[PDB]
Amino acid sequence: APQIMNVSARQTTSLDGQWKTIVDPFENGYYDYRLKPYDGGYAQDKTYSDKTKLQEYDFETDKLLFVPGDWNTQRPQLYYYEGTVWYRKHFEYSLQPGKRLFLNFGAVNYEAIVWLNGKRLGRHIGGFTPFNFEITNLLKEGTNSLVVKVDNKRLPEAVPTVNADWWNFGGITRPVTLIEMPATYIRDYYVQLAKDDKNMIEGWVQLEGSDKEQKITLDIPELKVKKEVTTDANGYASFLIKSKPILWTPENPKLYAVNLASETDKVSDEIGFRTIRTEGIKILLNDKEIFCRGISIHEETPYYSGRAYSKDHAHTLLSWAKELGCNFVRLAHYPHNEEMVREAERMGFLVWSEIPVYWTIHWENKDTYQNAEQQLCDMIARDKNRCNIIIWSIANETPHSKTRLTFLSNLANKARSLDSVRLIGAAMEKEEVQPGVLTVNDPLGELLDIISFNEYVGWYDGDSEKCDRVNWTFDTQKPVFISELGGGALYGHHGSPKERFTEEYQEDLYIRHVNMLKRIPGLAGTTPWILKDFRSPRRHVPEIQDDFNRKGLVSDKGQKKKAFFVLQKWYKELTEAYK
């Protein structure tokens, strides 16, 4: 089924909790010993109560896993696990005749195949985007059986591919929700300021069901807006509304109550309004020049470092970014859960939103492209009304090649065709064209609204001293945005500022690096890497990394490292300077 907008404001019933599970690395529940699909696999969820017959599994007496969640932090045996885990849930639901029922997954990494009562609903790939199935006519009276086959095996042709710098978190990682709808319902809608127009609200609305021609009212009571339209034979209607809304900023993240009521459905939202554009090397929010005082963040929890999903997780992480002095967060390297985006929206954080087109994607594979573009479409479709998002990012650290350029230009064009307002970015990389002279020479830059790139001078490229003896130049007059920078340190590990992975080295790096940043012309944003130490299978120094990337300014246990205050101090200066 197509995406449902604003799931949280619908008639929802959670299916979360603890589910029955079967770890199945050889996919015995799907394939027989000839490696063929067979009838009687684990999707049938047959309780093994008659022991005069033979079967090889029993959900009813197997172990549990929490849903939502990565499986990796739930059992020692699952820490590295890559492969199939079956999940099973029994539920009852009383669906009044004529109402519709949808099963919504916030995210499953990586491939999900879903059955209800032994009937296959469908299949999804892409670990960070939501998907749903209509189950209106498949629900039975009494106990219903939902089985989900989850597989997180790394595949060469997948998005992302077989190599990345974060943990391969498998499982049903975001909430599972039943959504009851009327027979014809408001499925999707868009309400935002028109491009560069502080005074014009535009949008549209899309109905789904057999009664597609209806009157619809868009209601913004605080703005005394009440616009009525009628949908066409395809259930669609658009609108233009002149209005002077108070404009959302990080300092005053104003949101308006927005109500949509058609004849057969109604839904409420919280939507803010703002204009965003570039002008030369300036980033203009509501026509005012801003600096993006940012920090990068992975979708991983404080303290126990599982996959984040809740408002609790988001608020804690963003409260650290608040203390750091940020007005901006880079959510890397994939769409985060919706609670993170919404909490950024209400607390006052501009957002960079990204799909995992990351490192050595298979640029020549047409299935790979369709998967990436599908993830692009789903990312924008979910969050198109989140006014704090100002940058869509289509790639991170991808090698230069002709097929790669073609691949990403198609993505950039698709992004613009879907959203004319927000800026298009991508984490490019730097080059030292001559000793001491750093720049970004990437043909991808021509398709981007900003010169966005990662650089690690003083960590990967030289010792801290090298920050002091380089300068930057750019051959185009677009805002410069450094989307990653920094260095590693273990909290509580102290020593000389020359000794790597001590807090003192990271502090000294941040001092010299900030001084370098202050010499860069056109610099309009920084999202250093990273807010919190996070899990990566590429970080193997014992007692220092222990499978964590240690470039947090905050430890995984919520402790602010020395370098945190260096960046906080610079962000205080930028706050005053951009007043």
User: Can you give the binding site for Cl ion, defined by CB under 5 A?
Assistant: 488, 549-550
> Which listed option, a second copy, Cl ion, none, makes contact with residue 498 (CB within 5 to 8 Å by class)?
a second copy
Residue of 40, 122, 221, 492 that binds a second copy (CB under 8 A): 492
Q: Give the residue with the Cβ less far from a second copy, 288 or 469.
A: 469
**Residue 540 near a second copy by CB under 8 A:** yes
**Residue 51 near a second copy by CB under 8 A:** yes
Q: Is 71 annotated as a binding residue?
A: no
Q: Is 165 annotated as a binding residue?
A: yes
Identify residues 277-316 at the interface with a second copy (CB under 8 A): 301-304, 306, 310, 312, 315-316
> Which listed option, Cl ion, a second copy, none, makes contact with residue 550 (CB within 5 to 8 Å by class)?
Cl ion
Amino acid (1-letter code) at residue 152: N
Q: Is 396 annotated as a binding residue?
A: yes
Least Å distance, CB 455 to a second copy, is: 15
**Residue 71 near a second copy by CB under 8 A:** no
Identify residues 223-242 at the interface with a second copy (CB under 8 A): none
Q: Which two tokens stand for residue 169?
A: 């978190």
**What angle (nearest 5°) sits at the alpha carbon of residue 547, between those of residues 546 and 551?**
90
Residue of 494, 518, 519, 572 that binds a second copy (CB under 8 A): 494
Helices (H), ranges, 327-451: 338-347, 366-383, 402-418
Identify residues 452-491 at the interface with a second copy (CB under 8 A): 459-460, 463, 490-491
| Cα 253 to Cα 341: distance, rounded to the nearest angstrom | 13
- Only segment of 11-19, 262-270, 345-353, 441-449 that touches a second copy (CB under 8 A): 11-19
> Which listed option, Cl ion, a second copy, none, makes contact with residue 288 (CB within 5 to 8 Å by class)?
none
**Number of residues binding to a second copy, judged by CB under 8 A:** 87
- Report CA Rg, the chain: 25
Confirm if 61 and 48 have CB atoms less than 8 A apart. yes
Residues in the chain: 579
Residue of 2, 8, 79, 287 that binds a second copy (CB under 8 A): 79
Residue reference for tokens 């010993």: 33
Burial 209-224 (b: 16+ CB within 10 A, else e): bebbebebebbbeebe
DSSP letter string, 469-530: G-EE--SS-S-EEEEE----B-TT----TTSTBSHHHHHHHHHHHHHHHHT-TTEEEE--S-
Confirm if 424 and 416 have CB atoms less than 8 A apart. yes
Quick one: 420 exposed, middle or buried, by C-beta within 10 A (0-12, 13-18, 19+)? exposed
Q: Give the residue with the Cβ less far from a second copy, 69 or 126.
A: 69
Angle between helices 402-418 and 366-383 (to 10 degrees): 30
**Residue 322 near a second copy by CB under 8 A:** no
> Which listed option, Cl ion, a second copy, none, makes contact with residue 83 (CB within 5 to 8 Å by class)?
a second copy
Q: Give the residue with the Cβ less far from a second copy, 176 or 225.
A: 176
Least Å distance, CB 155 to a second copy, is: 13
> Which listed option, Cl ion, a second copy, none, makes contact with residue 170 (CB within 5 to 8 Å by class)?
none
Q: Is 282 annotated as a binding residue?
A: no
Greatest C-alpha distance within the chain: 79
Other beta carbons within 10 angstroms of residue 574's beta carbon come to 18
Identify residues 88-147 at the interface with a second copy (CB under 8 A): 91-92
**Omega prior to 479 cis, within 30 of 0:** no
CB contact set of 353 (below 8 Å; sequence gap of 6+): 331, 335, 336, 341, 379, 383, 389, 391, 392, 393
Residue of 58, 213, 219, 263 that binds a second copy (CB under 8 A): 58
Residue reference for tokens 């000389």: 496
Q: Give the residue with the Cβ less far from a second copy, 110 or 491.
A: 491
Q: Is 460 annotated as a binding residue?
A: yes
| Cα 481 to Cα 354: distance, rounded to the nearest angstrom | 15
Q: Is 385 annotated as a binding residue?
A: no
| Cα 171 to Cα 72: distance, rounded to the nearest angstrom | 8
Q: Give the residue with the Cβ less far from Cl ion, 302 or 488.
A: 488
**Omega prior to 160 cis, within 30 of 0:** yes
**Residue 204 near a second copy by CB under 8 A:** no
Helix or strand (DSSP H, E) at 202: strand 200-208
Residue of 3, 9, 66, 138 that binds a second copy (CB under 8 A): 66
Identify residues 335-364 at the interface with a second copy (CB under 8 A): 359-360
Write out the binding residues. 165, 358, 396-397, 454, 460, 529, 539, 549, 551
Write out the binding residues for alpha-D-glucuronate. 165, 358, 396-397, 454, 460, 529, 539, 549, 551
